[PDB]
Amino acid sequence: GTSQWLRKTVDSAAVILFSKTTCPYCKKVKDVLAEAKIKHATIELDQLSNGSAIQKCLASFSKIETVPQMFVRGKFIGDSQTVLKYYSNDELAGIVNESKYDYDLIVIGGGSGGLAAGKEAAKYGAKTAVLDYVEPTPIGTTWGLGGTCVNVGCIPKKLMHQAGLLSHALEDAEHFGWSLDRSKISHNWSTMVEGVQSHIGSLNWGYKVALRDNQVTYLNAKGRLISPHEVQITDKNQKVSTITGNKIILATGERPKYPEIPGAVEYGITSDDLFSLPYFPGKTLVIGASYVALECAGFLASLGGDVTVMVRSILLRGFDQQMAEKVGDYMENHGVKFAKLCVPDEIKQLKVVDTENNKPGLLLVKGHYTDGKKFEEEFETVIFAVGREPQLSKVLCETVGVKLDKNGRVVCTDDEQTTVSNVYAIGDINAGKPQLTPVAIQAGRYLARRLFAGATELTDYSNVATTVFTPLEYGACGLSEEDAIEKYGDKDIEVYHSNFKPLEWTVAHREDNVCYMKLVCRKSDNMRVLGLHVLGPNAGEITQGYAVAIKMGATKADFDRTIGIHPTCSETFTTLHVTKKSGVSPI
Amino acid sequence: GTSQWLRKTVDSAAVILFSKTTCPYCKKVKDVLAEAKIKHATIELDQLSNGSAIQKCLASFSKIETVPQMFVRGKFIGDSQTVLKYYSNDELAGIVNESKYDYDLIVIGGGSGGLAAGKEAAKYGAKTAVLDYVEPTPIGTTWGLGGTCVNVGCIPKKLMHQAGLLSHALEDAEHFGWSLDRSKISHNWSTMVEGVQSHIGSLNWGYKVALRDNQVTYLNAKGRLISPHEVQITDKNQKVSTITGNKIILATGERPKYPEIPGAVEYGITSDDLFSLPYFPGKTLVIGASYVALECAGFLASLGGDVTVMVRSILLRGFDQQMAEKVGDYMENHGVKFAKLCVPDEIKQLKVVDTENNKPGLLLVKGHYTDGKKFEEEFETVIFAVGREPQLSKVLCETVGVKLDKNGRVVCTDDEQTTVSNVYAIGDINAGKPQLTPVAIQAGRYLARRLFAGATELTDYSNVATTVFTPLEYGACGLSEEDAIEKYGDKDIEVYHSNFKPLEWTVAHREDNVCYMKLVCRKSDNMRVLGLHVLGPNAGEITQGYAVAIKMGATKADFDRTIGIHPTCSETFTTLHVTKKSGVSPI
């Protein structure tokens, strides 16, 4: 079926050139396009394990069987002579710019995926437009280009995580001989925010420049897909116009949920507001129990905040629950209070946010524990981190025919195509995909390659590694222990585990047997590593590399015959020997 | 050749039991041995892809073809009935303790390998003795059980590395909002040493306990191999006696070299003395340019020391030299001065080490740069880190027949066997092996398994990963770029690289385009990753996991289809696209 790949490639590509590596006439075309700064994909049949079939099938479109053959938007343009002619006649610019639509690609959403897809697309000649609009939060918070991660996600989250960790670094420096009294050091929230925001500001700027430098049109406008090839844009001045595109990528991401209770929208905040908050939250109630709730509670606590987490049911639903308990136990043991089995009922305002002195308001939270007791406590800030939801009624008219799941996420095929053929969805809105920035980036860039460069490589959403940046980080790749057990049976699952202690925690006099790691393996598949789990410092760095081995089908034996790097936390994976079925202690 | 494996196993094993998983009579023997606390290897023919051949060949030794068959030191002991009998007759203790020699194993050297091998051996019934003696340094420095790593190596080295890094953590805490003036914080060397030494002291203690709890005999005595099965020990009281062992493991490690120049032994020190030094080195000259020299210079500089490094030729001979230059450039740019192309000629004493106030002496170093200029400078401490050499004339009489290479290291086969059949060498003295603690541990434990438990798995010394814990850490796994180019040719080597900036360095206002990583790949082998190189924080944690993938034959494509964890340094390996042959900037 090489025929069909060529049909799809030639159709969607904006400017593509078929060629061979060592080719006299092809290089004559390349040199011309370069001089005229005409960006284009290039397929080297020379370097393809089926290029002979392609070069012939190519005559289905060109009537010709020789390279170089140049195409513009499903349309053959000519051999060497015909191109050199267009150029010499100064008509080559107009030939490559012909198009039914204003753009080869319109990306609705200027975040991790949208920017990645849009930047990669222009690399291969796609006349591309990126649309981004940040609907303000209920209290007015807004921000610039870059998406959730850049502005109110991974980036500020980790920076404030890092500011938190330095709390422990300041405590440790004493044991390591530095002459500072941890007791006499405070943290200024505003100084931290100003630095975080300065860096986000440079990222906002950097993306705008990246789009300008790649001839990508950046529109700060709310995009609405009204027909498969028509996008309606409302700009800052409420001016409505319409633009057309061949391919459409939906990448509008999500936004925080608010529980439907009185005072929540009016008096509480979310992650969207926290990372630029002009005042220190103060005594803070985080409502929620997944990774945003615990990350935010973690660094607020480490930055000297009185922090409470309200847990309806469990921590980190969908994560390995043994790890989640270990995560929570560390936070409980380092300040964060947990109001277990507890749901809010209303948020009464007691003080308005003092905009003068940048100080938080004051709130009364009325709730109830599940055992009947009434929760009634005062907090200066209440943060909802109870989930995130797509906002696609604002992006689609169901007129168009983009099928959404029950959760409002776009239903796609394994190539991110929607039920409308020219329309794709990447990132958080793509149903059932892990909602992570590098996933959105990869999906976007790989999708861009298939459309405008004839690539075939799909994105592999399996065994995507992750790290919860709680005070004690938790990295994972693969199945939770309970999922593997459920998927294959207790009897087919062996679990190697060990506690460990960072060497840095020895002189610092931090805890024995708190850090912990485990490999979840399948006995009947050569002890294949199904899931990897590490609770410890720098769990992100630890886990990443193993995600390569796991994608390759790593077994327990592949870990054992690797030699550790000493001294590191990560090396504990190369010497795991205690199993769970044996009952021996992982200490 | 299952015959030969069984011959070797039965001969060397101390107490071994052949059995099947689901076996009535075998479990009757196990239960007896457990009750009597008789440690033993156990081969489950049930679980071996050739156990049928073994169970028959077994009758070569027992005259019997059924399980359970128990052997003691090359000698069949009996089926179920014969064992249950010995036990009931209370003669089973004496049967398993019969031996021509005092010990099944004598380990000469109580360090990383020796302790690992000795502990693993006793696990399988080996009547084991571990010998350790720390010959004092020229100035009298000595230490307890554990080896180079524990006492004067990885452990104190990394702890002082960590104390150094906190210097930058204290600077950064300000930008992240913490109210401390880095300018007004000093470091006390003695407090750090006391904490490092307290932890080493607990390790010294922990190993002694580990050996006691595993019925291993620990002798604090200098061992000398005088005949294949006889070891001569000189204890603390100069009392000479002799002990016999079936198997001998040489694991005596190495010690620092001193250059043959006046004043070096008398007035300078080495790594062996640095990590317990009662006084801060002060203005320090490190003589040497490999990983000890730069690690020690790095943290001395970060701890407020005026530090100079004397480089005869190049930094990190045998490492990727591009990385080494990047390593050195970072140290040069953060305090450490380099006296390039410079060799010392004498060390004159100007002040004696003040033992009263714990203050360093004072020294005059006379040298010459290669361009003729005379080096003449005063330093409070001079540290030689110019290499390490084995000390085996003190451990062997060439009488015995252990072949040593030209460098004095034991020449071994791929199973660590020496030219004397019962004698093995692990760790730094094993010629041509990477001189690293986890290598010595693995070699030791795997060797112990082959001897006393019938294992066959050899240690894999290929693509062993490593990390130089310089101020900016440098992790590597596989070939340097120059080695791969040399081994396969420039044309067959593609190098993907990228600079990067830790997110933590943004608010901290540290350097752009200093951190750096590269994959060295072979074009003609599916872009196999031949070497991995990362200069950046926590390079140990970053590199470890990738060492598993590389051992598995990871390609560039295996990296690309792995999804990054964001935000981390390590994730930059999953998106590498700039090559060197292209000349594009890695910024």
Ligand SMILES: Cc1cc2nc3c(=O)[nH]c(=O)nc-3n(C[C@H](O)[C@H](O)[C@H](O)COP(=O)(O)OP(=O)(O)OC[C@H]3O[C@@H](n4cnc5c(N)ncnc54)[C@H](O)[C@@H]3O)c2cc1C
């Ligand atoms: C607190 C928090 C912390 C996180 N930490 C991590 C982490 O550590 N590691 C990780 O991998 N992931 C993390 N994530 C997830 C990560 O942010 C998302 O996976 C990533 O942002 C998804 O990229 P995207 O393009 O799909 O959506 P987004 O990044 O949200 O981009 C969507 C853009 O399109 C805009 N938009 C919406 N509708 C329209 C419209 N009609 N027209 C124009 N623009 C529109 C949106 O306002 C936004 O600017 C975190 C998320 C949060 C909320």
Ligand SMILES: Cc1cc2nc3c(=O)[nH]c(=O)nc-3n(C[C@H](O)[C@H](O)[C@H](O)COP(=O)(O)OP(=O)(O)OC[C@H]3O[C@@H](n4cnc5c(N)ncnc54)[C@H](O)[C@@H]3O)c2cc1C
């Ligand atoms: C400053 C320094 C830093 C290092 N950092 C790292 C690192 O970060 N990561 C890493 O992987 N490796 C590191 N190493 C290397 C590591 O220490 C060695 O690879 C490891 O110690 C080797 O273990 P071994 O058993 O072979 O030798 P050793 O650990 O040296 O043990 C040998 C023991 O036997 C003793 N001995 C010698 N002769 C006799 C005798 N006749 N009788 C009885 N005992 C004897 C010795 O005194 C010693 O106690 C470092 C080394 C140094 C010097």
Ligand SMILES: O=S(=O)(O)C[C@H](O)CN1CCN(CCO)CC1
């Ligand atoms: O392959 S899986 O679907 O098993 C896992 C995905 O690749 C990535 N994960 C990341 C973590 N998520 C929830 C916490 O484990 C689920 C999706």
Ligand SMILES: O=S(=O)(O)C[C@H](O)CN1CCN(CCO)CC1
């Ligand atoms: O497989 S190799 O022999 O190529 C490498 C070894 O496995 C481990 N290395 C670690 C670093 N060493 C010198 C610096 O690269 C050489 C041995």
Ligand SMILES: O=C(O)c1ccc2cccnc2n1
């Ligand atoms: O969609 C997911 O499964 C998902 C999304 C975001 C995550 C963040 C940290 C840890 N795990 C995560 N999992």
Ligand SMILES: O=C(O)c1ccc2cccnc2n1
């Ligand atoms: O023997 C070796 O090759 C060897 C020994 C020790 C090392 C320490 C850090 C980095 N590399 C190293 N390499």
Ligand code: NA
């Ligand atoms: Na989003």
Ligand code: NA
């Ligand atoms: Na040694």
